[PDB]
């Protein structure tokens, strides 16, 4: 769940709601952090096998 | 890359959905399939 | 097609099988002082290196470690052609 602008502005009002279950949503700088961590040199060698 | 499409149900798979399926899949594979043919070196992988 | 520089890439499974050729190629040169300087000169290729670049401003075929395998291949190409006749 990425919380961003655009056409998902009608969905940001319930991100607080499903986070009360023990689940977490993400801002765009967080799914920035989460995919750039797939480019670490230990994942990079792991993708090659 | 993707297209914003919404309201296209199964009865309304329309031309914006055939163009979004080409953007997101049947020409994403041609994008990965073309970086393959331009590679000649097996020592440089391209992490998709 | 003589380049001015060449990047060697240490890529996947067979690419890590290529850079450990370069790690094992270690020359030892003791100094004039008698002390055995057992030192590492290839800091540039180690267990984290994924690419190394050979640089020569004149051209690679004029650089020393590439000019001499180009000759002895050419001179054996001319010899074995002469020998086959």
Question: Please, could you describe this protein's structure?
Answer:
- The structure is cut from a larger assembly and holds 2 copies of chain A and 1 copy of chain C (85 residues).
- Chain A contains 3 helices and 2 strands, in the order βαβαα.
- With 49 residues, chain A is mainly alpha-helical.
- Chain A has a two-stranded parallel ribbon with strand order 1-2.
- In chain A, strand 1, helix 1 (15-18) and strand 2 form a beta-alpha-beta unit.
- Chain A starts with a strand and ends with a helix.
- The relative contact order of chain A is 0.16.
- Chain C has 85 residues and is an alpha+beta fold.
- Chain C has a domain at 4-58: Helix non-globular (Hydrophobic Seed Protein), CATH 6.10.60.10.
- In chain C, 35% of the residues lie in helices and 12% in strands.
- Chain C has a two-stranded antiparallel sheet with strand order 1-2.
- Chains in contact: A-B, A-C, B-C.
- Chains A and B meet through loops of A and loops of B.
- It is classed as transferase.
- The entry lists the keywords Fungal Fatty acid synthase, transferase.
Principal-axis shape of chain C: extended
Which range best describes the helical content of chain C: under 10%, 10-25%, 25-40%, 40-55%, 55-70% or over 70%?
25-40%
- End-to-end separation of chain A in angstroms reads 29 Å
Q: Characterize the quaternary organization of these chains.
A: part of a larger assembly
Total number of beta strands of chain C: 2
The number of distinct helices of chain A, counting runs of at least 4 residues, comes to 3
Strand order of the largest sheet of chain A: 1-2
* Spatial ordering of strands, largest sheet of chain C: 1-2
Cα radius of gyration of chain C in angstroms: 18 Å
| Total number of helices of chain C | 2
Largest sheet of chain C: 2 strands, antiparallel
Helix proportion of chain A: 40-55%
Between the first and last Cα atoms of chain C, what is the distance in angstroms?
30 Å
The number of strands of chain A is 2
The biggest sheet of chain A amounts to: 2 strands, parallel
Specify the structural class of chain C: alpha+beta
The helix-strand sequence of chain C is: EHEH
Q: Which outline of chain A best applies?
A: elongated
